[PDB]
């Protein structure tokens, strides 16, 4: 990445305090609620008719955990997101047909969830490093689209 040692340590350090289970479920669910059109890929999950039905849906929660999982592992290859997400990039393009713009919506949602959770701790400089990471991830994931 174009992360500063200082920026790397901030990311890394906050991440250590994250409950992926909870943040993953919350991030995906907020996505389906704020940008309703993203529900087009999760019809099989059930009733997403209300915030409550989205936020409560176990399938949503479990997919959320899978996604943040993968994200989390990507934080360990911050100097080669491209190579870490190559296979995932192909899958998303060729099997799932997910428009990469969704990657960017989620990223922003993720940042709002971290701010929500960490209040004070999520300072302007810390948000700045996370914005760089979410953009980085989105780019990596979109890399194999053709």
């Amino acid at each position: 990445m174009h992360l500063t040692p200082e920026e790397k340590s901030a990311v890394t350090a906050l991440w250590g305090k994250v409950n992926v289970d909870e943040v993953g479920g919350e991030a995906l669910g907020r996505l389906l609620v704020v940008y309703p059109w993203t529900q087009r890929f999760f019809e099989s999950f059930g009733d997403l008719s209300t915030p409550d039905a989205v936020m409560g849906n176990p399938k949503v929660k479990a997919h959320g955990k899978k996604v943040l999982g993968a994200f989390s592992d990507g934080l360990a290859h911050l100097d080669n997101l491209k190579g870490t997400f190559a296979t995932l990039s192909e899958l998303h393009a060729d099997k799932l047909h997910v428009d990469p713009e969704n990657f960017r919506l989620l990223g922003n949602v993720l940042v709002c969830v971290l701010a929500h959770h960490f209040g004070k701790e999520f300072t302007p400089p810390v948000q700045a490093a996370y914005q760089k990471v979410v953009a980085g991830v989105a780019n990596a994931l979109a890399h194999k689209y053709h």
């Binding site: 940008y35 309703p36 059109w37 087009r40 047909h97 428009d99 713009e101 689209y145």
Partner: protein, 141 residues
């Protein structure tokens, strides 16, 4: 908002399109597929090969809708309601893609109407496609 001048410009340029609308619709699609490959994610079910009949078929449908908005330039929200519903509720195309298609339609018109694609007309056509896109995305949330 479209000014009287804008309206005149659009009816005029679109006027020239006439009977080639369908073909220009298809071409705009192909340009879009080639320049912005991420747009292909919405047509997994299409044959996107060159001269694809599905693309031909689709270009006509898009062109018909544009022709319909031109015909009803003073009541676009109502003339396109149905299409606005479809996109918001069924297709659920991310809004950013409208700008991509708009852009490719503008390239297409430019490539075919050299004498009409004046700076003034270019500007009016861009405001028009932006307005169509706005209508089509109005019921998203």
């Amino acid at each position: 908002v479209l000014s009287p001048a804008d309206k005149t410009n659009v009816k005029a340029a679109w006027g020239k399109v006439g009977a080639h609308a369908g073909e220009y619709g298809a071409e705009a699609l192909e340009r879009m597929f080639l320049s912005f490959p991420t747009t292909k994610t919405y047509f997994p079910h299409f044959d996107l090969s060159h001269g694809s009949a599905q693309v031909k078929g689709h270009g006509k449908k898009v062109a018909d809708a544009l022709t319909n908005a031109v015909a009803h330039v003073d009541d676009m929200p109502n003339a396109l309601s149905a299409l606005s519903d479809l996109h918001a509720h069924k297709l659920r195309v991310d809004p950013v893609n409208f700008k991509l298609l708009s852009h490719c339609l503008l390239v297409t018109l430019a490539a075919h109407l050299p004498a009409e694609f004046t700076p003034a007309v270019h500007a009016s056509l861009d405001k028009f496609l932006a307005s169509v896109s706005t209508v089509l995305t109005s019921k998203y949330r």
